[PDB]
């Protein structure tokens, strides 16, 4: 539903979806090759599957192709200023690709609508629902249109017949705390196969040791994991898979 949700919200709006309490496979998100840009700013694209986050946040919207280049911390514009923002400390990857033949309509579908003028600049990963008519000319606009009085937003026509920029490019942005909170989202953790009666290094759930793995009779308590011995020598192990 981050990527595969059919109809994303328009650009003035967006959805902050917390992603936590799960394991996050970035590989297919990395390996799908259906995404125009897989764009990481402060993290390693292939090391995601190895990297674990407490927080993750996905924000899914629609921008002009030429605006795809505009999103990057340090890169301002009509976007970063008004409709939606970038953190200047922003760290995380960015994934953009076109929805064109899906989201575009031959009539220049006016759902996707970008903020025209709201003077301020949003805070990182924030919006404003303001419909208030912008005031350019110092003469009071009275919350309506008039001389130098602008609707705060502006509505993209997306035609499938548009040039590159003016087609819709769905952009979902990621987020995280990394560690420093109780960790929830991690990348998948790749188990190997098993070998018995052959001296092997091994790792189990993070337990690391080396020995001769063998089947044993002794029974555990279902919540218990390791074994030990008198000498605190990690001994039995319950096979996690």
């Amino acid at each position: 539903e981050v990527f595969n949700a059919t109809r994303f919200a328009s650009v003035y709006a967006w959805n902050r979806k917390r992603i936590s309490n799960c394991v996050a496979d970035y590989s297919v998100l990395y390996n799908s090759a259906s995404f125009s840009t897989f764009k990481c700013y402060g993290v390693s694209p292939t090391k995601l599957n190895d990297l674990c986050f407490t927080n993750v946040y996905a924000d899914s919207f629609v921008i002009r192709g030429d605006e795809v280049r505009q999103i990057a911390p340090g890169q301002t514009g009509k976007i970063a200023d008004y409709n939606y923002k970038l953190p200047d400390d922003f760290t995380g990857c960015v994934i953009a690709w076109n929805s064109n033949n899906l989201d575009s309509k031959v009539g220049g579908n006016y759902n996707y609508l970008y903020r025209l003028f709201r003077k301020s600049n949003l805070k990182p990963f924030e919006r404003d629902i303001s419909t208030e008519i912008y005031q350019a000319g110092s003469t009071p606009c009275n919350g309506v249109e008039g001389f130098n009085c602008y609707f705060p937003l502006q509505s993209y026509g997306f035609q499938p017949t548009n040039g590159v920029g003016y087609q819709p490019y769905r952009v979902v942005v990621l987020s995280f705390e990394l560690l420093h909170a109780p960790a929830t989202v991690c990348g998948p953790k790749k188990s190997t196969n098993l070998v018995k009666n052959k001296c092997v290094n091994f790792n189990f759930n993070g337990l690391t040791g080396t020995g001769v793995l063998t089947e044993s009779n002794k029974k555990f308590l279902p919540f218990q994991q390791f074994g030990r011995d008198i000498a605190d020598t990690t001994d039995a192990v319950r096979d996690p898979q």
Partner: antibody
Amino acid sequence: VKLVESGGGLVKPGGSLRLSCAASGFTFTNYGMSWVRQAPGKRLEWVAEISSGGSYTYYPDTVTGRFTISRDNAKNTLYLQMNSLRAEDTAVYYCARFRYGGGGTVDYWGQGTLVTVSS
Amino acid sequence: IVLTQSPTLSLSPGERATLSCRASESVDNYGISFMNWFQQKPGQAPRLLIYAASNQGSGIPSRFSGSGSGTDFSLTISSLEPEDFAVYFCQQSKEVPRIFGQGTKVEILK
């Protein structure tokens, strides 16, 4: 800027008439492309299509022109391979090129593809 | 949908050419600006004119001008020239294959 097309051809009704639209002076990907017909004694009929960053290739549905459309973006060449040929297909075909997004357009045009299907 | 145009005019040099692009069913745009203008010269490939009737610019000479209201689109070409007149067109948008106009050509006497 400039749309070069395939030359004339004369076939019988019912077959598949291939064409090619050679692009000179623009990026063929950045522009959704098309094949539009000006038929003898007729209005311009927008017929064949392809989009820029995707594959569109819709027609007037009606009786589908059905003409096979593909792209070689190395050649920058749009193809019109006209399925269900008929005598009415006699016309001057224009592979056209659109503008960047808006209320239109078709900016430039082919020089026309003379096409005659008859006995 | 389907549209109709002013088929022809017969006029003199240095005059306005009022060309109505009359759209059946859909009228212009929800975003208030649509249809188009196009020109195909006799013995010549078609050529862009205006889009949303209010618009385009350089590359389309200043004589080309006009607007449209709902169905009808008025292509107003001021100061006609006997060398400059040729069949004109207007594309639909927002519904149906965008098609074109039935063709529009302003004759010029003298």
